[PDB]
Design a protein around this ligand. Structure first.
Ligand SMILES: Cc1ccc(C(=O)/C=C(\O)C(=O)O)cc1
Ligand SMILES: [Mg+2]
Ligand code: NI
Length: 712
């Protein structure tokens, strides 16, 4: 209610003051001009942000009418989408021209960690996760089974530590082979002639490929750590025979450190509840501390500094201590009262984010004002833009970034774009979307969770969908994943840009992650998303076993996905399911909505571990909420289930979600109809069909605001 008028804009004062007193000092931008430019960018690109948002509903309306009129003529289907401007012609082959891109993106294949920018500790850890102890990763997770006396105890279990050490020596054997013998046999390491030599219990061998020896610390004659490289990622053997772990170790190894989270996406979108100017500032403030380089916590944990090594021959070089940081703005749909206009119309959140995260990112290009730590050593600003539907929304984002770079005084194409392939209209037009961003594009990623949501909502009217667990094997999603890699490699992404795959959500099943997430490097993705620093280092194993660049060479030119397979709607069969299976699917989805929503609405937490009805802790975000809510809406709109069926499941799941929590937590049960979060969940399902492209934000935002408001 207390705002600052600049032009047609009414800036909430908390935002204005933050920009003026915290973000703008050090950017060379005079606050007068910046706001005047903000007002100017808002006023003129709001029309096209609104046109594009209008195109989405009218395309969807035409599709909904087509299915309801109508046993499905697929040639006619694809022709209709071509006729309404949903499917557009493929452009002809081209190479992306994006320049000034950090090497972690162009060349390096490895994990990419995603973290809510609103949690400064998490963001701190994510930035520091560029380096991760393989030992702590293995010890702390189920990768080493708690069996035969290897169970995690309140104190260090030396049986567990041995399987840890043994596992890591196996890894080193597969990544950096010795000419003869194994690292398990190693008794010590020295550097001679610029070449690493390892002491065995009989002879002394070297590296199979000595070029994998990348450096060391300490004296040549007994390093405190040897630095190894494999497939562009560094491995560090910490050597300390006096350390407790090193004392037991054949070679005095204290730890093996993996280069892990090569890049990190600091997220303003599906993993945060940022509903108003107060919420947005907390996130912008964290983004500012990360770009300054002085973000810190007590309970003093700092951002890591760079790591220095002696080069194998002479030299004293330096590797990045922290993960190269992206920011994920919100998409184009949502609106935020942080800025209202003269007439009360909220300003578009995506525009605001581009200017504010853009402005703040200026500090991360220098190192004393701007703070001491550099993010991009190439002057690029990395914004992944999510939920774009089609190439005209990409073009608008590039124009948007163009205008922001004007207001901000940056050269053009400073603001690079990570395109989320995660709406159906981007999938079937992906090559045109990359073209629309040919000079700003820096990755594509299959947002397979939002993409499933878009899939269900687009063909909502076609009939019941398969159960959610079944989507992973549907023709459309398998073509979607292969198509994304193809189009990226056809666009020149190899060595120029990242081809990225989606998020491992089972944060407690690391053994399974180590077993199955290798499929993503093996399919040619140069990065894949991990929810956690620990997961980053474990998923880093996979880039040591799979030569991602070599996989992408072999995939060149191959077109493994037809337009017809991309358009295969995941409809369920005839007799479908037993009431058995139906109820399981309803209970499962209702408990995943409720568990996620209650923390979103009552505590403004956008990313929660939520056990499903098989007691598997799932890291849940808005995208997973969108699937669950759209699938029940679809099952509802076709009579697979009843509105009272959905309420009964919500009623019976609420107490079990209540007992999955406690704290600061507010019990949903028994006063269901007067718990705001409960009604938010119910409305996400009962009104799921009505939301624009099934997005959950409109209902989540307004219910969060209303919860905040009843905290009067
Ligand atoms: C913990 C977490 C963080 C981010 C995401 C997410 O953004 C996925 C995608 O963008 C997409 O699969 O839709 C999921 C879980
Ligand atoms: Mg997504
Ligand atoms: Ni190899």
């Amino acid at each position: 209610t207390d705002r600052v008028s600049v032009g047609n804009l009414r800036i909430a004062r908390v935002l204005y003051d933050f920009v003026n007193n915290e973000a703008l000092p050090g950017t060379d931008i005079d606050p007068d001009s910046f706001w005047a430019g903000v007002d100017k960018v808002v006023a003129d690109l709001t029309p096209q942000n609104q046109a594009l948002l209008n195109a989405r509903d009218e395309l969807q309306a035409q599709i909904d009418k087509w299915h309801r009129r109508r046993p499905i003529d697929m040639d006619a289907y694809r022709q209709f989408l071509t006729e309404i401007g949903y499917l557009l012609p493929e452009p002809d082959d081209f190479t992306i021209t994006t320049s000034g891109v950090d090497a972690e993106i162009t060349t390096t294949a490895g994990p990419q960690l995603v973290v809510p920018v609103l949690n400064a500790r998490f963001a701190l850890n994510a930035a520091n996760a560029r380096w991760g102890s393989l030992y702590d990763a293995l010890y702390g997770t189920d990768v080493i089974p708690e069996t035969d006396g290897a169970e995690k105890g309140p104190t260090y279990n030396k049986v567990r530590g041995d399987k840890v050490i043994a596992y890591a020596r196996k890894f080193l054997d597969d990544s950096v082979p010795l000419s003869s013998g194994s690292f398990g046999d190693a008794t010590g390491f020295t550097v001679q002639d610029g070449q690493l030599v390892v002491a065995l219990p009989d002879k002394s061998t070297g590296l199979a490929n000595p070029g994998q020896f990348a450096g060391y610390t300490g004296a040549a004659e007994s390093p405190t750590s040897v630095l190894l490289i494999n497939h562009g990622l560094h491995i560090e053997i910490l050597i300390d025979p006096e350390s407790q772990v090193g004392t037991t170790d054949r070679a005095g190894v204290k730890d093996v450190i993996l280069e892990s989270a090569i890049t990190t996406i600091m997220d303003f979108e599906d993993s945060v509840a940022a509903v108003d100017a107060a919420d947005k500032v907390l996130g912008y403030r964290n983004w500012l501390g990360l770009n300054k380089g002085d973000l810190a916590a007590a309970v003093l944990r700092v951002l890591n500094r760079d790591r220095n090594y002696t080069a194998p021959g002479g030299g004293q070089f330096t590797l990045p201590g922290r993960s190269l940081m992206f920011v994920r703005n919100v998409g184009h749909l949502m609106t935020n009262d942080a800025i209202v206009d003269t007439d009360g119309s909220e300003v578009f959140e995506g525009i605001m984010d581009a200017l504010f995260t853009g402005l703040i990112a200026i500090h991360g290009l220098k190192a004393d004002v701007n703070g001491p730590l550099i993010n991009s050593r190439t002057g690029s600003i990395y914004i992944v833009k999510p939920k774009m539907h089609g190439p005209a929304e990409v073009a608008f984002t590039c124009e948007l970034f163009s205008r922001v770079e004007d207001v901000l005084g940056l050269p053009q194409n400073t603001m690079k774009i990570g395109i989320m392939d995660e709406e159906r209209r981007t999938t079937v037009n992906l090559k045109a979307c990359i073209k629309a961003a040919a000079d700003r594009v820096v990755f594509i990623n299959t947002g397979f969770l939002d993409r499933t949501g878009d899939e269900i909502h687009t063909s909502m009217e076609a009939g019941p969908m398969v159960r959610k667990g079944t989507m992973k094997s549907q023709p459309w999603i398998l073509a979607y994943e292969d198509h994304n890699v193809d189009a990226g490699l056809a666009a020149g992404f190899s060595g120029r840009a990242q081809v990225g795959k989606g998020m491992w959500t089972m944060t407690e099943l690391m053994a399974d992650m180590v077993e199955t997430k290798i499929a993503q490097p093996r399919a040619g993705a140069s990065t894949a998303w991990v929810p956690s620093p620990t997961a980053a280092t474990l998923h880093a194993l996979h880039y040591h076993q799979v030569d991602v660049a070599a996989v992408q060479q072999g995939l060149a030119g191959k077109r493994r996905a037809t337009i017809e397979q991309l358009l295969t709607i995941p409809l369920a069969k005839e007799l479908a399911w037993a009431p058995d299976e139906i109820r399981e699917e309803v209970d499962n989805n209702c408990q995943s909505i409720l568990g996620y929503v209650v923390r979103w609405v009552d505590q403004g937490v956008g990313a929660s571990k939520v056990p499903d009805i098989h007691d598997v802790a799932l890291m849940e975000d808005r995208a997973t909420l969108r699937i669950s809510s759209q699938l029940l809406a679809n099952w509802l709109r076709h009579g697979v289930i009843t509105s009272a069926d959905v309420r009964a499941s919500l009623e019976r799941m609420a107490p079990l979600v209540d007992r999955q929590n406690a704290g600061a937590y507010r019990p949903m049960a028994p006063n269901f109809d007067d718990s705001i979060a409960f009604l938010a969940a119910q409305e996400l399902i009962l009104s799921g069909a009505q939301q624009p492209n099934g997005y959950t934000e409109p209902i989540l935002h307004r219910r969060r605001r209303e919860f905040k408001a009843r905290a009067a």
